[PDB]
Design a protein around this ligand. Structure first.
Ligand code: FAD
Ligand code: FAD
Ligand code: 4W0
Ligand code: 4W0
Ligand code: 4W0
Ligand code: 4W0
Ligand code: TRT
Ligand code: TRT
Ligand code: TRT
Ligand code: TRT
Ligand code: TRT
Ligand code: TRT
Ligand code: MG
Ligand code: MG
Ligand code: MG
Ligand code: MG
Ligand code: MG
Ligand code: MG
Ligand code: MG
Ligand code: MG
Lengths: 495, 495
């Protein structure tokens, strides 16, 4: 008669929650239509065949039996509805049979889905890069085109059109997918398809001026330079406005009147999140959240507007709306001991108060750039209000989904139904840095305190980092073997 | 201006011909809708996940550039018609575009296709085991059923029906597929799906009394016994007469009035060859062969009824009809040493005459069991006629397709258009033995001079043999890694 936790989703949030939740203390069931976890950062490597599926996945059932002897459960179902008042969910199986399941706690970790921005033709003609199947269909399509263009029944003009790969999105995924194809094209493809090599082209399309815009400006410049040197067409300051079967249209970001029509053989849509239908439907059943576009949780990751406080959400499907500083001005004033309401006084209690208000974190509020002398209570109120307003929810990353999962599973293991049940601290994420592979052995990294901008050892750095991020020795084994395989025998052409 | 050889098929015949044909001497194009070679003997290992696709395939384009600097070509096309008088073929691409190609020599190696014996429902409901895609669909279906039966919305009786795997055919493929699933079920499946393990069953269905009927009787008995000990249902002396969506019917071979209806979740059809449509159509355009069921070639592998003798066929798509001894009686009599026509006299010239008549081979004619005293010329004629009649074409195996490919490519390299062009010997195959994996570490082997019947080292023997039969170091690399992988981390569930 253990308390029942249902986890929705087998992704970065759901799977890492499963990995850490105590199966002895709780009865845990994970529910997802996907019976494996996907190591998403390595998906671009799958498009070119640099790494294989064994590196990029984990089967959920392999992690249901922990060392202590207590077990979790897994069900291959898609959740369609949540009924928070009666504490059950409705699911369907692959045959649309309905399943009803009761819970004591619900962890919503259903992620997000691809977003076409309703641009005509994108869903019909473009390839997304969101999961294992996506990457493999992309790889297979490219391989198919190479074989098709080796046939005698096609002209050089038609080849140039068919062998043009266009990647839409200048963020890390678009960049890495482009880099991986450029390497593949320049190495194995050049060797095995020498007669059509010269007709192959790649373009990357990005609305802003910078590839990798969330990295540093020096990294962006170096990335565009590396792409130029690789003869990739860098179409920064352009965005897609229409997609047809054999061509698409782009629009200048600098001149609204300038458009271009481009022929293509493979169109890859590397960008865009939208909310799952489950989340859209769930929102409308919570009065307080009825017209939200995204699920809001509080600073403890509890879904807002649930009287029972027994539904949580983590990862890409949620945004945090923390307890407001300015609704607790007087309490905070008393807490301040340096009696003189200054920003420095507040910062002096920031260790204690961040346990309640994550927006006070030095990672969330720049105290040095927002210093304030002595304030009246009303002015202090207004200041707290600015800190509230400034709070940024965790970015939609694997990094944050993983940290939230560990935080929350630890809360269930060591705080809930124990004498620390009222000492639960708020969630505050830690940025660990970002990495990107940008072609021809060059890796860039934007880390706390370091930037990496290519060089002979940058690819070594990437391997050292990722082998430690993999979640099993099996995957690490494959990670190592795949690089040996690729070095000695090259990328595979089997499709 | 080099002479053009077109090879049809990328299989055991076609690919091994490609591996050995001199690209300097000829202009070689291989044509096949499959741009990889399939190492068919390891396909059962793929069904259970014991080995991966990288062990079982070779990409054709990897072998087009030989060390000399001379190259072959490959085109992804399906051949639809041969026009032997005008020395060209018609092909289609994957989009049904027609391609016309001329040749100086044509090597037909298109193999065979699956045969349902027109039994109602097998093409609709059964899974075949002939190529990479077949094996993977079988694996995926089995994995899908396991997940479906873990759902709460299904009774135990429905589970027993759904988790029944039936394999039709008691030859090596059927036996090996059954053994691989039995191992998978008893190991990884038992561990990951403990709650439904007890509902899983496997049956193998075979018309004759023996599993592995082409092996020795001791091997057949040991195999049936090993299957019993693994609680596999061995349905020898039964054959399938009808297949429906959820059940099939079998018929006793020993009592025509006894039938049984059996429920099943996965039905695997491991047996049956039929001729390709291409061969069926080609036959009707050759007057002398117009009503044949299979393509006949002479002792030098030349298709019969082609005035230009420039079409050859090898592998499963052909049968050899050698030059008849009895149509050359007087010539043979003169060749014989002494004046007395005895079977021993014939056997004394058997080395020389076997270069012309493969049916005189000691591997084809038992001289000791057909000893003959002094014969009159007419009696000798009748004796020769018996040898002609006794000749058996090479069995449809990878071993024979490979040997035919090496024989014929060597004929092109070293006999055709050289001063040995009239010293071309007939094709005579060499039996090297057979191997089968029969479950729970047990390997059997029927070899010249040895039989292997399981034991601790039989699996080691299997590995030693197969790693030497693989056609590249890449595949051998994967062969070794896969066994390490499977030992340390188990077979994968990713699908
Ligand atoms: C190509 C690519 C590269 C990336 N690289 C990085 C990187 O380098 N660094 C980084 O920090 N982040 C990276 N990310 C981001 C990271 O993948 C996401 O932020 C992360 O997936 C979020 O985790 P999640 O658990 O919220 O969603 P997901 O990991 O997507 O998991 C969602 C799960 O919910 C399941 N699900 C969906 N609907 C339902 C339903 N109705 N009922 C039950 N289950 C359902 C899905 O099958 C899936 O298992 C990358 C993403 C992509 C696509
Ligand atoms: C599961 C399994 C296990 C086996 N195990 C063994 C074993 O242990 N030992 C053994 O000796 N034999 C074994 N065999 C038999 C062996 O696979 C066959 O005898 C062998 O494949 C015959 O070689 P082939 O070249 O004639 O045909 P295949 O190897 O089948 O090749 C035929 C090729 O022709 C291509 N093709 C088909 N139609 C056309 C067309 N119209 N135009 C152009 N190309 C075309 C096909 O795509 C294929 O590439 C096994 C077979 C199977 C199915
Ligand atoms: C091995 C291999 C494959 C692969 C595996 C299995 C198949 C199965 C398959 C399915 C259908 C087929 O019918 C048809 F002929 F139609 F394609 C053929 C094969 C195809 C490709 N992908 C990879 C993808 C990324 C990186 C990799 F390292 C690999 C890799 O190393
Ligand atoms: C090594 C290396 C490679 C790689 C693979 C193929 C090539 C092929 C290639 C590219 C450019 C070429 O023109 C030339 F070399 F002339 F510049 C020629 C071949 C180059 C690099 N990918 C990686 C991808 C991700 C993470 C990594 F750690 C690596 C990595 O460590
Ligand atoms: C790794 C791996 C796989 C495998 C590879 C790629 C996929 C790709 C895939 C395609 C579609 C998907 O969407 C869906 F989930 F819907 F199926 C998911 C994955 C699936 C399985 N087969 C194997 C088969 C035999 C032996 C093996 F060792 C493997 C193996 O080691
Ligand atoms: C080793 C080995 C195996 C193998 C794989 C899994 C098991 C799992 C297993 C099966 C039955 C079990 O209950 C019992 F032990 F009772 F039999 C327990 C585990 C057993 C053998 N297949 C092979 C397949 C082909 C070629 C080979 F060379 C091997 C081989 O060398
Ligand atoms: C785990 O979340 C998945 C997100 O993957 C993003 C890749 O970014 C990696 C940067 O984060 C780090 C930081 C430090 C490290 C350690 C300390 C483990 C490795 C080291 C020594 C290379 C810095 C690893 C990864
Ligand atoms: C069962 O748990 C597996 C998941 O482990 C999660 C934490 O892993 C962090 C450490 O991971 C590694 C990975 C590789 C290595 C090796 C041995 C390859 C050495 C290295 C990374 C220093 C080069 C060391 C530690
Ligand atoms: O027993 C389970 C076996 O797994 C435990 C250790 O697994 C590994 C896997 C890979 C590795 C590295 C990364 C060093 C690669 C290796 C052993 C293939 C060289 C080390 C240990
Ligand atoms: C030639 O490839 C055709 C496919 O054959 C697959 C079945 O193999 C059956 C075994 O026949 C052989 C072939 C070679 C060998 C060698 C000589 C390579 C192995 C050895 C040294 C262990 C006896 C043994 C048995
Ligand atoms: C480029 O060559 C690839 C094709 O090779 C065909 C001929 O191969 C026959 C010998 O093959 C092997 C395979 C493995 C080995 C090793 C080194 C693994 C030793 C072994 C088989 C004795 C265990 C030796 C010879
Ligand atoms: O060809 C290009 C160079 O790569 C060929 C490497 O050849 C081998 C030799 C041995 C092996 C085995 C399987 C014996 C070696 C092992 C143990 C490293 C996997 C694999 C590949
Ligand atoms: Mg998740
Ligand atoms: Mg995931
Ligand atoms: Mg998501
Ligand atoms: Mg989520
Ligand atoms: Mg062939
Ligand atoms: Mg083959
Ligand atoms: Mg065949
Ligand atoms: Mg053939």
């Amino acid at each position: 008669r253990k308390e029942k936790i249902i986890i929705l989703g087998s992704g970065w949030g759901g799977f890492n929650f499963l990995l850490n939740i105590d199966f002895k203390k709780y009865d845990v069931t994970l529910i997802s239509p996907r019976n494996y976890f996907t190591f998403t950062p390595l998906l671009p490597c799958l498009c070119s065949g640099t790494l294989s599926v064994n590196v990029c996945t984990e089967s959920i059932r392999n992690f249901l039996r922990k060392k202590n002897g207590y077990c979790g459960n897994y069900l291959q179902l898609e959740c369609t509805d949540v009924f928070y008042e009666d504490k059950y969910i409705n699911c369907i199986d692959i045959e649309n049979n309905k399943v009803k399941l009761f819970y004591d706690y619900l962890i919503i970790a259903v992620g997000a889905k691809t977003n076409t921005f309703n641009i005509n033709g994108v869903d019909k003609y473009a390839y997304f890069v969101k999961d294992i199947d996506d990457a493999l269909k992309i790889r297979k399509k490219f391989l198919d085109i190479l074989e098709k263009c080796t046939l005698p029944n096609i002209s050089n003009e038609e080849k140039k059109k068919m062998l043009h790969v266009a990647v839409v999105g200048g963020g890390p995924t678009g960049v890495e997918v482009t880099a991986e194809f450029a390497d593949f094209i320049n190495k194995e493809v050049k060797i095995n398809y020498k007669d059509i090599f010269n007709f192959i082209s790649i373009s990357i399309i990005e609305g802003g001026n910078n590839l990798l815009p969330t990295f540093t400006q020096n990294i962006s410049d170096f990335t565009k330079e590396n792409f130029h040197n690789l003869n990739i067409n860098v179409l920064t300051n352009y965005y897609v406005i229409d997609v047809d079967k054999h061509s698409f249209h782009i629009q200048s970001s600098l001149n609204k009147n300038e458009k271009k029509k481009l022929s293509y053989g493979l169109l890859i849509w590397a960008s865009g999140l939208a909310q799952t239908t489950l989340i859209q439907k769930f929102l409308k059943t919570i009065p307080v959240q009825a017209n939200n576009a995204i699920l809001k949780v509080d600073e403890k990751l509890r879904v807002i507007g649930i009287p029972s406080n027994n539904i949580y959400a983590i990862g890409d499907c949620k945004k945090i709306q923390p307890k407001l500083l300015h609704e607790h001005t007087n309490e905070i004033i008393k807490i301040l001991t340096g009696n003189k309401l200054t920003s420095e006084a507040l910062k002096l209690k920031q260790s204690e108060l961040t346990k309640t208000f994550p927006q006070l974190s030095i990672s969330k509020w720049d105290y040095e750039k927002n210093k304030k002398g002595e304030m009246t209570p009303q002015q202090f109120h207004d200041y707290l209000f600015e800190i509230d307003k400034n709070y940024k929810s965790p970015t939609p990353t694997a990094q944050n989904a993983k940290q939230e999962a560990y935080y929350l599973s630890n809360v269930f293991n060591n705080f809930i139904h124990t004498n620390q049940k009222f000492n639960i601290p708020s969630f505050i994420e830690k940025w660990k840095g970002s990495l990107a592979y940008i072609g021809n052995h060059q890796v860039v990294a934007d880390l706390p305190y370091y930037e990496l901008k290519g060089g002979r050892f940058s690819s070594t750095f990437w391997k050292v980092v990722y082998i430690q991020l993999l979640l099993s020795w099996k995957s690490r084994f494959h990670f190592f073997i795949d690089f040996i395989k690729t070095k000695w025998y090259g990328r595979p052409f089997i499709k």
